[PDB]
A paper describes a structure:
Nylon hydrolase (NylC) is one of the three enzymes responsible for the endo-type degradation of the by-products of nylon-6 manufacture (cyclic and linear oligomers of 6-aminohexanoate (Ahx) with a degree of polymerization greater than three) and various aliphatic nylons (e.g., nylon-6 and nylon-66). However, the post-translational autocleavage of the nascent polypeptide between Asn266 and Thr267 generates an active enzyme with an α subunit (27 kDa) and a β subunit (9 kDa). Based on the X-ray-crystallographic structure of NylCA, we reported that four αβ heterodimers (molecules A-D) form a doughnut-shaped quaternary structure. In addition, we proposed that the nucleophilic N-terminal residue Thr267 in the β subunit functions as a catalytic residue for either autocleavage (from precursor to active enzyme) or substrate hydrolysis.
To extensively analyze the effect of amino acid substitution at position 122, we constructed 10 new mutants in which Asp122 of NylCp2 was replaced with other amino acids by site-directed mutagenesis. The values of Tm (melting point of the heat denaturation) and ΔH (change in enthalpy for the global unfolding of proteins) were determined by regression analysis using nonlinear least-squares fitting of the CD melting curve. The Tm values increased in the order of Asp122 (wild-type NylCp2) < Leu < Gln < Asn < Arg < Lys < Val < Gly and ranged from 52.9 °C to 75.1 °C (type 1 mutation in Fig. 2). However, the D2 symmetry was partly altered by mutations at position 122. Plotting the protein stability (Tm value) estimated from the CD analyses against the distance between the two monomer molecules revealed that the protein stability exhibited an inverse correlation with the a2/a1 ratio (index of symmetry). In other words, the ratio changed from 0.979 to 1.197 from the wild-type (Asp122) to the mutant (Arg122, Lys122, Val122, and Gly122) enzyme, although this value should be equal to one for a perfectly symmetric structure. A clearer correlation was found between thermostability and the nearest distance between the side-chain atoms on helix α2 and helix α1. Notably, this distance decreased with an almost linear correlation with increasing thermostability in the wild-type and mutant enzymes.
Numbering used by the authors:
A (entry chain B), B (entry chain B): 19 to 260, 267 to 355
C (entry chain A), D (entry chain A): 18 to 260, 267 to 355
Write the structure that this text describes.
Amino acid sequence: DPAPRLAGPPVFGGPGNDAFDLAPVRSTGREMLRFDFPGVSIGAAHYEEGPTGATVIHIPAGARTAVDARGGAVGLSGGYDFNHAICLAGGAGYGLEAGAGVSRALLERLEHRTGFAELQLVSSAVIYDFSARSTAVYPDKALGRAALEFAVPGEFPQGRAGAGMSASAGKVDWDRTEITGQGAAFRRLGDVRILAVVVPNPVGVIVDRAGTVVRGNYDAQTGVRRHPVFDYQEAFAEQVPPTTISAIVTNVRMSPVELNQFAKQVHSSMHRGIQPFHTDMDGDTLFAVTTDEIDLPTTPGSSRGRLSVNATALGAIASEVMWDAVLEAGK
Amino acid sequence: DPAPRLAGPPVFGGPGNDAFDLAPVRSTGREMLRFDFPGVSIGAAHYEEGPTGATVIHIPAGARTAVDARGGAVGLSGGYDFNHAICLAGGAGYGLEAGAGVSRALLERLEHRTGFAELQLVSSAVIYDFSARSTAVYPDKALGRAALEFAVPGEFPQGRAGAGMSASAGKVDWDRTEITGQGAAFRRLGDVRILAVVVPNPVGVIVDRAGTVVRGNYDAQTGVRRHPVFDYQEAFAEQVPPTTISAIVTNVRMSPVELNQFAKQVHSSMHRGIQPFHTDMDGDTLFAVTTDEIDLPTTPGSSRGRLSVNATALGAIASEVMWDAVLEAGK
Amino acid sequence: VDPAPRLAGPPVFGGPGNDAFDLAPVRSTGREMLRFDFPGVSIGAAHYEEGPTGATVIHIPAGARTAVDARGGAVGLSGGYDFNHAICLAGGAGYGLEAGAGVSRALLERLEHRTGFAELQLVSSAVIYDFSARSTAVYPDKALGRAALEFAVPGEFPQGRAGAGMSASAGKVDWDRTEITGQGAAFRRLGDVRILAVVVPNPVGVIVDRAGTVVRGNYDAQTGVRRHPVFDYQEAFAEQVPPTTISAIVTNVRMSPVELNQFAKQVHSSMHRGIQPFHTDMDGDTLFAVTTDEIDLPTTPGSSRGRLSVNATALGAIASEVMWDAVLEAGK
Amino acid sequence: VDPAPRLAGPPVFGGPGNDAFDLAPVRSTGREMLRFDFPGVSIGAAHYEEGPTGATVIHIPAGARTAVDARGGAVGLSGGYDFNHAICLAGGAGYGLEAGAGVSRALLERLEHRTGFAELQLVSSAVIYDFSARSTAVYPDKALGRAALEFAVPGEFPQGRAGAGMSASAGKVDWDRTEITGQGAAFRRLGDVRILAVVVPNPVGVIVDRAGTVVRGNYDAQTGVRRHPVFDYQEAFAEQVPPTTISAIVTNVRMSPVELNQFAKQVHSSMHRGIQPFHTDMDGDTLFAVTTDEIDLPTTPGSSRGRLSVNATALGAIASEVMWDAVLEAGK
């Protein structure tokens, strides 16, 4: 069982962006994931003064996207069905401003052309990360611009980096909440590529494939993490009466209908590794993005089964890549 | 590991409803679950000639409902935000007819009154159960009427009963698909009551809390069940290039917004016990029903945490009741 | 001249249900038959006189891509599939969804009870609440849906009090001012582009013509005229707060699922021109947009009449006019 | 007399962006000021002359329950929250969502950078694409949103070319027939019931008056008149296929989340009376319905004008008229 990373008690009343001369820092995290996915770049920037940050997935050619905004408390901008970038950030709704920095930078690179087919489309989503620190600094336009400027192919900074600087899990009680991070994972199968990026700031906890609670809801009195349902059920017996933001990027061609159902499938699959999930208190948002490079076969058979090669199959594989990313964030 | 229940190869071309004098049978299943939930009755009927059936949850007072029709291939009638009954049936879209039998019977009990506030509201959902047998018999109006007539308080027939007669799991290849059943579970916590009813006919498999595949995708060549993702990933490496219908019934008062988010949360939670889930091939539909009898406290604290008594907490508990029901169906 | 009143009259209580009668389906002929040319689409309308109530079925045996826009607050819908062999529109409130089950079973029997995936017969159904306009509880049952399918023929539609429109009515600020409507259809061919609109207006609101005149619903027998409901509503607020329409649009033009869904929303909203108010909490307004996928639009949208003149939006605008014509036929 | 033309003119390429200019926000005054009495609601409108483009902000410091009806096919939306302290409407296509970020930051600073849940300042923003109506790439940026908030006052709205309406335009079958619109507002008080409509029509379609006359958009300089787009569309099909509006409705009447959501849909659909076509694939039509939760409706819906005359549907019908008035002010 990993050592605790308790976030500690809230400290509200701290300084905001106006109080500082804020210098973006290129986030490196605890280690770098390297992968091969041409046409996809990732940048991450933070302000130490928060600490808080933004992570940007840049696909300069633009890519078809489906959004599954399933949570009860979503903070989303754009949510477009085609994107040049996805911006994930802390700072609650204020952090949507980071995406404006990305949009503006992309407009400038386009030489301020504004034809419909030239509009640069950025979708952004946010986590509330203010309870995990004692400043009011947030990802502003300048920080989103920096994250884009820092974007490079084939690298992702794991852990406390970008949007994951002050992400945290397990919010039955803030005395038991632990810092998470951001995470990524990548698989290549034949010509198929799947990249998962996640910033888990859940009300729930991170759970591994054995069912062990590995991050969140850590009680310093016991030295042990608990699945929230044990707290909830005892709370009811006593008293009645007395957000995760994520992206899956693939190169497989999917129709709008397939892509949208793929998004829903992968997003629901994350209730395996984050529990509870999709709650009223969460603003869970998944972006499913395809670069539309590889055709699935017209018929779905293989030696492994009559119905084995299709978008559902891809969704099941992508679900595993995403669980791996969640576990990297919690590590 | 449980003994296999392989469904076997499709047999299309069999007789339909017209070929028989169809006698409804009161379904008893393998065993009866007994529970205490005043105002809620359950009836289950089948035709042996299918075998196929319908299961009806009757709440004569009517109850607030949210529907989460999350699957790609849903077969739903009504989907109302207030219901006197929920009808779950086999027979694919033809089995929606069983719900008409329930509606008509309720109209007759109301003495054919038709004022707005007197309309009897039945929501129905279906599974495709024709690949698991060799007739075209389906749950018709007469069978829905019978299921309602057989409804009694505080009993549920587990296993091959009602809508679960010919339910099956694990559909990467039909040579590895196994018969499931229907299942229920019940918990009472203080004054709070939660009943889960499920009819798993998934493309995916049933998974227990340890991560063991316990029903579906059984290979007679090996004697072992496999998680579908192992088949899918190898299929991709080789070739590129070379429904669950459910209800959660509770007595806790929830606003329409809370109830709807509760539905989404519990439904996503079922991706723990059914994998994959919410796929394009599935018509997954969950009804969340409240009899609106018990208030949650106005503030959410307990000795177990500051945020421990609320609708999210209820959703986490209900999720466990539903997983128990799924495992009963697969037993 | 203003249209003569067709007041529905007061609600009547205690009336019998289906099995009180030996119910024979009647092939509905309405006031007039619309004739049109659209191979692959058949319309059947059946009623029970004892209601009076009925069902109208659109049968497209090839199956057709469909978008559903269930925009009202009080929708009664079954199936709502993205691909359909038939659409069933019926009276009887939620009980009338049973008529669609009759259509489904009849189609299953035509397929010799085959049940493979590619042969599942898909029927979407929607209903109106028509019990305030008569004094029985008879509803469109499985037998009536079956009969409407059996009566379906290409190129004909019975206007007026026929099928699902038999007891449709409009203008429900007060039941003393509610008038019987009917069902309606209209058809246009532009080259080989074909657009068929079918509507069963049972609105809370009233039917309005292109000049803005209220022509069916909210007839005040004390004044002899119809005025817009908003006059009643605004007067009611000053006093007391002191200081369903089911429809289908069928076309032969290929539209992607995304285009077709937006087309549905556009055409459905356009009906707030002819029905006012519309899309209210009290309404179960449901439109089915169906394409038989026969004709492509040009790859680029230009013509002599503009750079953006030939596209799904353009088709939506044309279809919206066909639908308004259909609404006015229902109210006529 | 038919209105004089306000043709937008052809698209112009190569124009500069924000930092090419020393951009000073200007408080927009429009052609005329609407004055009204609705304490708790403030409106600010700011523009950059160098665009010309602008933003219009509705500030409700108590916070207000909101329903969003993002019905168009090409929506540009940020937040879309069910509870808002401000609504920001802006030009600049998706880039103009940045104006809302300026509003959010300004509100955060008024709260002394407090960040507890109950103090998060929630701003929903929507945009129009206004770059075809001018020859720069200037957009509403964070500074302009901040300025529009700072300029917000109760009881005033600048009609016409002001705020987000500075470069709004209508009628886009062909750009040679597109006309500048503006923004518009209307207000009614019925007792102590208050209804404010704000609209920024940038439609593909045209603005239509209550008589059915096209009054802004699709002006053909070769004929000197405006006709409905459907005439162009139908002619285009015969030839080539041979054989955004952003808006808010604010009221003080308490509505549950369910009523408020249906109210939004009803009022939004009603705008297809004044804007035609509407809700098209080409439009990003987004309506915000906001209630300040001050007045209850009576528990039962009766009055002298009918049994079902005082309810959220009634309120929706009245609000729909206020909105049509606002649309006509924008087109005037």
